[PDB]
Amino acid sequence: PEFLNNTEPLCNVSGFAIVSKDNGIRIGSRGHVFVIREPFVACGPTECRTFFLTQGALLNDKHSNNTVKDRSPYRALMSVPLGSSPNAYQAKFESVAWSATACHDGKKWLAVGISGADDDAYAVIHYGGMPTDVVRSWRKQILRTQESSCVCMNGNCYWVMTDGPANSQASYKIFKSHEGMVTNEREVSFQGGHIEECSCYPNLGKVECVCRDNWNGMNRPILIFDEDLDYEVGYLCAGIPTDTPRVQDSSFTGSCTNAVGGSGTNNYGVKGFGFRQGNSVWAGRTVSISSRSGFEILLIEDGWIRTSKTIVKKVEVLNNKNWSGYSGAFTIPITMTSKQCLVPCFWLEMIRGKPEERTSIWTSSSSTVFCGVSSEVPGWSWDDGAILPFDIDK
Protein backbone atom coordinates (compact mmCIF):
# COMPACT_ATOMS: atom_id res chain seq x y z
CA PRO A 1 0.00 0.00 0.00
CA GLU A 2 1.56 3.20 -1.34
CA PHE A 3 0.37 6.74 -2.04
CA LEU A 4 -1.05 7.11 -5.55
CA ASN A 5 0.82 9.70 -7.62
CA ASN A 6 -2.14 10.82 -9.77
CA THR A 7 0.17 13.24 -11.59
CA GLU A 8 -0.62 11.82 -15.04
CA PRO A 9 -2.45 13.84 -17.71
CA LEU A 10 -6.18 13.42 -18.12
CA CYS A 11 -7.07 11.18 -21.07
CA ASN A 12 -8.50 12.49 -24.32
CA VAL A 13 -11.86 10.81 -24.91
CA SER A 14 -14.17 10.74 -27.93
CA GLY A 15 -17.18 9.29 -26.11
CA PHE A 16 -18.57 8.08 -22.81
CA ALA A 17 -19.74 4.49 -22.30
CA ILE A 18 -22.23 3.58 -19.57
CA VAL A 19 -20.62 1.88 -16.58
CA SER A 20 -23.32 1.23 -13.98
CA LYS A 21 -26.97 1.85 -13.16
CA ASP A 22 -28.14 1.15 -9.63
CA ASN A 23 -31.95 1.15 -10.16
CA GLY A 24 -32.18 2.10 -6.49
CA ILE A 25 -35.68 3.56 -6.47
CA ARG A 26 -37.12 0.64 -8.48
CA ILE A 27 -35.50 -1.82 -6.07
CA GLY A 28 -36.56 0.40 -3.16
CA SER A 29 -40.22 -0.09 -4.05
CA ARG A 30 -40.09 -3.37 -2.09
CA GLY A 31 -36.51 -3.64 -0.83
CA HIS A 32 -34.93 -1.68 2.01
CA VAL A 33 -33.20 1.24 0.28
CA PHE A 34 -32.21 4.62 1.67
CA VAL A 35 -33.84 7.84 0.56
CA ILE A 36 -30.83 9.73 -0.82
CA ARG A 37 -29.52 12.68 -2.72
CA GLU A 38 -26.38 13.38 -4.66
CA PRO A 39 -24.82 9.71 -5.37
CA PHE A 40 -21.27 10.69 -6.22
CA VAL A 41 -18.48 8.30 -7.13
CA ALA A 42 -14.87 8.12 -5.96
CA CYS A 43 -12.29 5.46 -6.81
CA GLY A 44 -9.50 3.94 -4.77
CA PRO A 45 -6.60 1.88 -6.12
CA THR A 46 -8.67 -1.33 -6.16
CA GLU A 47 -12.34 -0.29 -6.31
CA CYS A 48 -14.82 2.43 -7.24
CA ARG A 49 -17.61 3.28 -4.80
CA THR A 50 -20.84 5.27 -4.88
CA PHE A 51 -21.09 7.61 -1.90
CA PHE A 52 -24.35 9.31 -1.01
CA LEU A 53 -26.17 11.40 1.57
CA THR A 54 -29.25 10.04 3.43
CA GLN A 55 -31.34 11.12 6.45
CA GLY A 56 -31.76 7.56 7.70
CA ALA A 57 -35.16 6.98 6.11
CA LEU A 58 -36.02 4.15 3.69
CA LEU A 59 -38.20 4.33 0.61
CA ASN A 60 -41.92 3.69 1.20
CA ASP A 61 -41.49 4.45 4.91
CA LYS A 62 -43.24 7.29 6.73
CA HIS A 63 -39.87 8.77 7.75
CA SER A 64 -39.28 9.64 4.07
CA ASN A 65 -41.84 12.43 4.56
CA ASN A 66 -39.89 15.32 3.10
CA THR A 67 -41.59 18.28 4.90
CA VAL A 68 -39.01 21.17 4.93
CA LYS A 69 -35.92 22.21 2.97
CA ASP A 70 -33.48 22.27 5.92
CA ARG A 71 -30.25 20.58 6.92
CA SER A 72 -30.74 17.76 9.38
CA PRO A 73 -28.90 16.18 12.31
CA TYR A 74 -30.14 12.83 10.94
CA ARG A 75 -28.21 13.18 7.67
CA ALA A 76 -25.17 11.00 7.06
CA LEU A 77 -22.61 10.08 4.40
CA MET A 78 -22.55 6.40 3.41
CA SER A 79 -21.16 4.35 0.53
CA VAL A 80 -21.76 1.15 -1.44
CA PRO A 81 -19.89 -0.69 -4.21
CA LEU A 82 -20.27 0.99 -7.60
CA GLY A 83 -23.57 -0.07 -9.16
CA SER A 84 -25.23 -1.29 -5.96
CA SER A 85 -28.46 0.17 -4.66
CA PRO A 86 -27.98 2.33 -1.54
CA ASN A 87 -29.58 -0.33 0.64
CA ALA A 88 -29.65 -0.74 4.41
CA TYR A 89 -27.50 -3.89 4.60
CA GLN A 90 -24.67 -3.11 2.16
CA ALA A 91 -24.26 0.57 3.06
CA LYS A 92 -21.04 1.48 4.87
CA PHE A 93 -21.10 4.47 7.22
CA GLU A 94 -18.49 7.16 6.48
CA SER A 95 -19.52 10.34 8.33
CA VAL A 96 -22.23 12.44 9.87
CA ALA A 97 -22.89 14.94 7.08
CA TRP A 98 -25.36 17.22 5.36
CA SER A 99 -22.56 18.21 2.95
CA ALA A 100 -19.62 16.02 2.04
CA THR A 101 -16.70 15.05 -0.16
CA ALA A 102 -14.56 11.91 -0.27
CA CYS A 103 -11.52 10.47 -2.08
CA HIS A 104 -8.70 7.94 -1.64
CA ASP A 105 -5.00 8.47 -0.87
CA GLY A 106 -3.98 5.19 -2.38
CA LYS A 107 -3.52 4.02 1.23
CA LYS A 108 -6.83 4.90 2.91
CA TRP A 109 -10.23 6.43 2.28
CA LEU A 110 -10.66 10.11 3.15
CA ALA A 111 -14.17 11.38 3.92
CA VAL A 112 -15.07 14.96 4.87
CA GLY A 113 -18.50 15.42 6.42
CA ILE A 114 -20.07 18.68 7.59
CA SER A 115 -22.74 18.83 10.30
CA GLY A 116 -23.88 21.30 12.95
CA ALA A 117 -26.05 24.38 13.00
CA ASP A 118 -26.16 26.76 10.04
CA ASP A 119 -24.33 29.46 11.97
CA ASP A 120 -21.68 27.28 13.59
CA ALA A 121 -21.23 24.13 11.47
CA TYR A 122 -17.98 22.16 11.23
CA ALA A 123 -16.35 19.50 9.06
CA VAL A 124 -15.10 16.22 10.51
CA ILE A 125 -12.28 14.62 8.53
CA HIS A 126 -12.38 10.80 8.50
CA TYR A 127 -9.18 9.02 7.44
CA GLY A 128 -9.37 5.23 7.31
CA GLY A 129 -12.56 5.33 9.38
CA MET A 130 -11.39 7.83 11.89
CA PRO A 131 -11.85 11.44 13.03
CA THR A 132 -8.45 12.96 12.43
CA ASP A 133 -9.12 16.70 12.08
CA VAL A 134 -11.81 19.39 12.04
CA VAL A 135 -12.51 22.44 9.88
CA ARG A 136 -14.67 25.12 11.52
CA SER A 137 -16.93 27.53 9.67
CA TRP A 138 -15.15 30.88 9.16
CA ARG A 139 -18.23 32.90 8.08
CA LYS A 140 -20.94 31.18 10.17
CA GLN A 141 -23.30 30.81 7.18
CA ILE A 142 -23.85 27.14 6.08
CA LEU A 143 -20.35 25.76 5.66
CA ARG A 144 -20.51 23.45 2.67
CA THR A 145 -18.45 21.47 0.16
CA GLN A 146 -18.24 19.72 -3.25
CA GLU A 147 -20.86 16.88 -2.99
CA SER A 148 -18.46 14.85 -5.16
CA SER A 149 -15.03 13.25 -5.07
CA CYS A 150 -12.06 15.26 -3.86
CA VAL A 151 -8.57 14.85 -5.38
CA CYS A 152 -5.46 13.17 -3.96
CA MET A 153 -1.99 13.49 -5.50
CA ASN A 154 1.34 12.36 -4.01
CA GLY A 155 -0.25 11.59 -0.65
CA ASN A 156 -1.95 15.00 -0.38
CA CYS A 157 -5.70 15.53 -0.79
CA TYR A 158 -7.49 18.70 -1.86
CA TRP A 159 -11.05 20.00 -1.80
CA VAL A 160 -12.98 23.27 -2.05
CA MET A 161 -15.33 24.76 0.54
CA THR A 162 -17.81 27.64 0.63
CA ASP A 163 -19.00 29.71 3.59
CA GLY A 164 -21.48 32.53 3.06
CA PRO A 165 -24.81 33.32 1.40
CA ALA A 166 -26.12 30.97 -1.27
CA ASN A 167 -27.62 33.84 -3.32
CA SER A 168 -24.99 36.56 -2.70
CA GLN A 169 -21.24 37.09 -2.58
CA ALA A 170 -19.64 34.43 -0.38
CA SER A 171 -16.17 33.21 0.64
CA TYR A 172 -14.40 30.35 -1.12
CA LYS A 173 -11.39 28.37 0.13
CA ILE A 174 -9.08 25.59 -1.05
CA PHE A 175 -7.94 23.10 1.59
CA LYS A 176 -4.91 20.80 1.54
CA SER A 177 -4.66 17.75 3.79
CA HIS A 178 -2.15 14.98 4.49
CA GLU A 179 -3.26 11.74 6.17
CA GLY A 180 -6.40 13.55 7.28
CA MET A 181 -4.53 16.51 8.79
CA VAL A 182 -5.11 19.93 7.22
CA THR A 183 -1.67 21.25 6.25
CA ASN A 184 -2.59 24.36 4.21
CA GLU A 185 -5.51 26.48 3.07
CA ARG A 186 -6.06 29.37 0.66
CA GLU A 187 -8.96 31.78 0.16
CA VAL A 188 -9.99 32.40 -3.46
CA SER A 189 -10.54 36.09 -4.24
CA PHE A 190 -13.55 36.07 -6.56
CA GLN A 191 -15.58 39.29 -6.20
CA GLY A 192 -18.68 39.19 -8.39
CA GLY A 193 -18.47 35.40 -8.72
CA HIS A 194 -20.11 32.50 -6.89
CA ILE A 195 -18.41 29.10 -6.23
CA GLU A 196 -20.53 26.16 -5.04
CA GLU A 197 -20.39 22.32 -5.30
CA CYS A 198 -17.28 21.99 -7.40
CA SER A 199 -16.56 18.87 -9.53
CA CYS A 200 -12.74 18.48 -9.47
CA TYR A 201 -10.31 16.05 -11.11
CA PRO A 202 -6.52 15.71 -11.43
CA ASN A 203 -4.84 16.79 -14.66
CA LEU A 204 -1.02 16.71 -15.00
CA GLY A 205 -0.36 17.36 -11.32
CA LYS A 206 -2.87 20.22 -11.08
CA VAL A 207 -6.45 20.19 -9.80
CA GLU A 208 -9.10 21.47 -12.21
CA CYS A 209 -12.64 22.19 -11.01
CA VAL A 210 -15.90 23.04 -12.80
CA CYS A 211 -18.39 24.50 -10.30
CA ARG A 212 -21.88 25.97 -9.90
CA ASP A 213 -22.74 29.66 -9.72
CA ASN A 214 -25.85 30.07 -7.55
CA TRP A 215 -25.88 33.90 -7.83
CA ASN A 216 -25.52 35.69 -11.21
CA GLY A 217 -24.08 33.13 -13.60
CA MET A 218 -25.61 30.63 -15.97
CA ASN A 219 -22.04 29.80 -16.98
CA ARG A 220 -19.93 27.68 -14.66
CA PRO A 221 -16.99 28.93 -12.58
CA ILE A 222 -13.59 27.38 -13.29
CA LEU A 223 -10.93 26.95 -10.61
CA ILE A 224 -7.44 25.51 -11.15
CA PHE A 225 -4.75 25.22 -8.47
CA ASP A 226 -1.43 23.48 -7.76
CA GLU A 227 0.11 21.72 -4.75
CA ASP A 228 1.08 25.08 -3.20
CA LEU A 229 -2.57 26.21 -3.60
CA ASP A 230 -1.56 28.85 -6.14
CA TYR A 231 -4.67 29.25 -8.25
CA GLU A 232 -6.40 30.93 -11.15
CA VAL A 233 -10.17 31.42 -11.08
CA GLY A 234 -12.80 32.41 -13.64
CA TYR A 235 -15.64 31.00 -15.74
CA LEU A 236 -15.86 28.42 -18.51
CA CYS A 237 -14.83 30.36 -21.61
CA ALA A 238 -17.19 28.56 -24.00
CA GLY A 239 -20.06 30.53 -25.49
CA ILE A 240 -22.29 27.62 -24.50
CA PRO A 241 -24.00 27.89 -21.09
CA THR A 242 -24.13 24.65 -19.10
CA ASP A 243 -25.85 25.56 -15.83
CA THR A 244 -29.57 25.09 -15.20
CA PRO A 245 -31.55 27.32 -15.46
CA ARG A 246 -30.16 29.06 -18.55
CA VAL A 247 -31.23 30.55 -21.87
CA GLN A 248 -30.95 28.90 -25.27
CA ASP A 249 -27.46 28.89 -26.77
CA SER A 250 -28.03 31.52 -29.47
CA SER A 251 -29.18 34.00 -26.79
CA PHE A 252 -25.88 33.71 -24.88
CA THR A 253 -22.51 35.46 -25.06
CA GLY A 254 -19.64 33.70 -23.32
CA SER A 255 -17.00 35.03 -20.96
CA CYS A 256 -13.77 33.62 -19.54
CA THR A 257 -13.78 35.98 -16.55
CA ASN A 258 -17.27 37.12 -15.47
CA ALA A 259 -20.68 35.67 -14.66
CA VAL A 260 -23.35 36.07 -17.36
CA GLY A 261 -26.93 35.83 -16.10
CA GLY A 262 -30.26 37.59 -16.06
CA SER A 263 -33.31 36.58 -18.10
CA GLY A 264 -34.77 34.85 -15.03
CA THR A 265 -31.86 32.47 -14.40
CA ASN A 266 -30.35 34.12 -11.31
CA ASN A 267 -30.21 32.76 -7.75
CA TYR A 268 -30.19 29.08 -8.75
CA GLY A 269 -28.13 26.41 -10.47
CA VAL A 270 -27.27 22.72 -10.63
CA LYS A 271 -24.08 20.90 -9.73
CA GLY A 272 -22.29 19.91 -12.92
CA PHE A 273 -18.93 19.05 -14.42
CA GLY A 274 -16.48 19.54 -17.25
CA PHE A 275 -13.26 17.97 -18.49
CA ARG A 276 -10.47 19.96 -20.12
CA GLN A 277 -9.39 18.40 -23.43
CA GLY A 278 -6.26 20.29 -24.39
CA ASN A 279 -7.89 23.55 -25.42
CA SER A 280 -11.41 22.08 -25.81
CA VAL A 281 -13.78 20.82 -23.09
CA TRP A 282 -16.32 18.06 -22.54
CA ALA A 283 -19.16 19.71 -20.61
CA GLY A 284 -22.32 18.14 -19.24
CA ARG A 285 -25.69 19.86 -18.98
CA THR A 286 -29.40 19.15 -18.72
CA VAL A 287 -31.34 19.09 -21.99
CA SER A 288 -34.08 21.39 -20.68
CA ILE A 289 -33.05 25.00 -20.12
CA SER A 290 -35.49 25.67 -17.25
CA SER A 291 -35.70 22.38 -15.32
CA ARG A 292 -33.71 19.28 -14.37
CA SER A 293 -34.75 17.08 -17.29
CA GLY A 294 -32.60 15.06 -19.67
CA PHE A 295 -28.82 14.99 -19.91
CA GLU A 296 -26.17 15.39 -22.61
CA ILE A 297 -22.40 15.88 -22.90
CA LEU A 298 -20.98 18.49 -25.29
CA LEU A 299 -17.48 18.56 -26.78
CA ILE A 300 -16.92 22.30 -27.32
CA GLU A 301 -13.95 23.02 -29.58
CA ASP A 302 -11.48 25.43 -27.91
CA GLY A 303 -14.17 25.91 -25.25
CA TRP A 304 -11.66 26.03 -22.39
CA ILE A 305 -9.74 29.08 -23.69
CA ARG A 306 -12.20 31.07 -25.83
CA THR A 307 -15.89 31.81 -26.19
CA SER A 308 -16.43 29.18 -28.88
CA LYS A 309 -19.90 28.08 -30.00
CA THR A 310 -18.57 25.18 -32.10
CA ILE A 311 -19.97 21.89 -30.78
CA VAL A 312 -18.15 19.06 -32.54
CA LYS A 313 -19.79 16.22 -30.57
CA LYS A 314 -23.01 15.78 -28.61
CA VAL A 315 -24.19 12.58 -26.90
CA GLU A 316 -27.50 12.34 -25.05
CA VAL A 317 -27.58 9.87 -22.14
CA LEU A 318 -31.10 10.82 -20.99
CA ASN A 319 -33.92 12.32 -23.04
CA ASN A 320 -35.96 15.39 -22.08
CA LYS A 321 -38.92 13.20 -21.07
CA ASN A 322 -37.09 12.04 -17.91
CA TRP A 323 -35.84 13.71 -14.73
CA SER A 324 -32.11 14.34 -14.25
CA GLY A 325 -30.38 16.29 -11.45
CA TYR A 326 -26.81 16.72 -10.21
CA SER A 327 -23.73 15.53 -12.12
CA GLY A 328 -20.13 15.23 -10.97
CA ALA A 329 -16.65 14.29 -12.12
CA PHE A 330 -14.13 11.66 -11.02
CA THR A 331 -11.14 9.82 -12.47
CA ILE A 332 -9.97 6.19 -12.59
CA PRO A 333 -6.42 5.59 -11.29
CA ILE A 334 -3.72 4.02 -13.47
CA THR A 335 -2.92 1.15 -11.07
CA MET A 336 -6.01 -0.37 -12.64
CA THR A 337 -6.08 0.67 -16.29
CA SER A 338 -2.31 0.22 -16.81
CA LYS A 339 -2.54 3.32 -19.00
CA GLN A 340 -0.48 6.49 -18.64
CA CYS A 341 -3.34 9.00 -18.65
CA LEU A 342 -6.20 9.36 -16.17
CA VAL A 343 -9.61 8.18 -17.40
CA PRO A 344 -12.32 10.85 -16.99
CA CYS A 345 -15.70 9.64 -15.74
CA PHE A 346 -18.91 11.24 -14.53
CA TRP A 347 -21.99 10.20 -12.56
CA LEU A 348 -25.56 11.35 -13.18
CA GLU A 349 -28.19 11.73 -10.46
CA MET A 350 -31.85 11.30 -11.42
CA ILE A 351 -34.28 12.89 -8.96
CA ARG A 352 -37.77 11.45 -8.39
CA GLY A 353 -40.60 12.85 -6.29
CA LYS A 354 -40.87 16.44 -5.09
CA PRO A 355 -40.71 19.11 -6.33
CA GLU A 356 -41.52 17.98 -9.87
CA GLU A 357 -43.82 15.09 -8.85
CA ARG A 358 -46.11 16.44 -6.13
CA THR A 359 -48.24 13.32 -5.58
CA SER A 360 -45.25 11.86 -3.69
CA ILE A 361 -44.41 12.96 -0.13
CA TRP A 362 -40.70 12.20 -0.59
CA THR A 363 -37.64 12.93 -2.71
CA SER A 364 -34.85 10.53 -3.68
CA SER A 365 -32.65 9.71 -6.65
CA SER A 366 -30.88 6.91 -8.50
CA SER A 367 -27.85 7.12 -10.75
CA THR A 368 -25.99 6.19 -13.92
CA VAL A 369 -22.21 6.35 -14.33
CA PHE A 370 -20.20 6.85 -17.53
CA CYS A 371 -16.50 6.76 -18.43
CA GLY A 372 -14.59 8.12 -21.41
CA VAL A 373 -13.04 5.91 -24.08
CA SER A 374 -10.80 6.35 -27.11
CA SER A 375 -13.61 5.98 -29.65
CA GLU A 376 -17.02 7.58 -30.14
CA VAL A 377 -19.98 5.79 -28.60
CA PRO A 378 -23.72 6.30 -29.17
CA GLY A 379 -26.14 7.55 -26.55
CA TRP A 380 -29.52 6.37 -25.33
CA SER A 381 -31.87 7.22 -22.44
CA TRP A 382 -31.18 5.30 -19.21
CA ASP A 383 -33.98 6.67 -17.07
CA ASP A 384 -34.70 5.99 -13.41
CA GLY A 385 -37.59 3.63 -14.13
CA ALA A 386 -39.56 3.79 -10.89
CA ILE A 387 -43.34 3.93 -11.31
CA LEU A 388 -44.73 6.70 -9.11
CA PRO A 389 -46.56 7.32 -6.85
CA PHE A 390 -45.49 4.71 -4.29
CA ASP A 391 -47.64 3.00 -1.65
CA ILE A 392 -46.54 5.39 1.11
CA ASP A 393 -47.93 8.22 -1.07
CA LYS A 394 -51.44 6.77 -0.74
Ligand SMILES: CCC(CC)O[C@@H]1C=C(C(=O)O)C[C@H](n2cc(-c3ccccc3)nn2)[C@H]1NC(C)=O
Ligand atom coordinates in the same frame (compact mmCIF):
# COMPACT_ATOMS: atom_id res chain seq x y z
C1 LIG B 1 -27.30 25.58 0.64
C2 LIG B 1 -26.24 25.50 -0.46
C3 LIG B 1 -26.45 24.40 -1.47
C4 LIG B 1 -26.01 24.88 -2.88
C5 LIG B 1 -26.97 25.83 -3.49
O1 LIG B 1 -27.84 24.16 -1.50
C6 LIG B 1 -28.21 22.85 -1.92
C7 LIG B 1 -29.42 23.07 -2.82
C8 LIG B 1 -29.67 21.74 -3.59
C9 LIG B 1 -30.43 21.87 -4.74
O2 LIG B 1 -29.95 22.61 -5.58
O3 LIG B 1 -31.47 21.24 -4.95
C10 LIG B 1 -30.10 20.77 -2.44
C11 LIG B 1 -28.99 20.64 -1.38
N1 LIG B 1 -29.69 19.73 -0.50
C12 LIG B 1 -29.44 18.44 -0.42
C13 LIG B 1 -30.42 17.96 0.48
C14 LIG B 1 -30.59 16.53 1.01
C15 LIG B 1 -29.56 15.64 0.90
C16 LIG B 1 -29.68 14.37 1.36
C17 LIG B 1 -30.84 13.98 1.93
C18 LIG B 1 -31.87 14.84 2.05
C19 LIG B 1 -31.76 16.13 1.56
N2 LIG B 1 -31.15 19.02 0.81
N3 LIG B 1 -30.70 20.05 0.20
C20 LIG B 1 -28.56 21.93 -0.84
N4 LIG B 1 -27.34 21.64 0.01
C21 LIG B 1 -27.41 21.85 1.38
C22 LIG B 1 -26.23 21.56 2.24
O4 LIG B 1 -28.38 22.23 1.85
Ligand SMILES: *[C@@H]1O[C@H](CO)[C@@H](O)[C@H](O)[C@H]1NC(C)=O
Ligand atom coordinates in the same frame (compact mmCIF):
# COMPACT_ATOMS: atom_id res chain seq x y z
C1 LIG C 1 -46.37 13.59 6.09
O1 LIG C 1 -46.47 14.83 6.82
C2 LIG C 1 -47.71 15.52 6.64
C3 LIG C 1 -47.60 16.83 7.39
O2 LIG C 1 -47.04 16.64 8.68
C4 LIG C 1 -48.87 14.65 7.12
O3 LIG C 1 -50.10 15.32 6.88
C5 LIG C 1 -48.85 13.31 6.40
O4 LIG C 1 -49.86 12.45 6.92
C6 LIG C 1 -47.48 12.64 6.55
N1 LIG C 1 -47.44 11.38 5.82
C7 LIG C 1 -46.93 10.25 6.33
C8 LIG C 1 -46.97 9.05 5.44
O5 LIG C 1 -46.46 10.21 7.46
Ligand SMILES: *[C@@H]1O[C@H](CO)[C@@H](O)[C@H](O)[C@H]1NC(C)=O
Ligand atom coordinates in the same frame (compact mmCIF):
# COMPACT_ATOMS: atom_id res chain seq x y z
C1 LIG D 1 -4.82 15.27 -25.31
O1 LIG D 1 -5.09 16.07 -26.46
C2 LIG D 1 -4.48 17.37 -26.41
C3 LIG D 1 -4.96 18.12 -27.63
O2 LIG D 1 -3.88 18.73 -28.32
C4 LIG D 1 -2.96 17.22 -26.37
O3 LIG D 1 -2.37 18.50 -26.27
C5 LIG D 1 -2.56 16.36 -25.17
O4 LIG D 1 -1.16 16.11 -25.21
C6 LIG D 1 -3.31 15.03 -25.18
N1 LIG D 1 -3.01 14.26 -23.98
C7 LIG D 1 -2.68 12.97 -23.99
C8 LIG D 1 -2.41 12.35 -22.65
O5 LIG D 1 -2.62 12.32 -25.03
Ligand SMILES: [Ca+2]
Ligand atom coordinates in the same frame (compact mmCIF):
# COMPACT_ATOMS: atom_id res chain seq x y z
CA1 LIG E 1 -26.65 29.76 -11.88
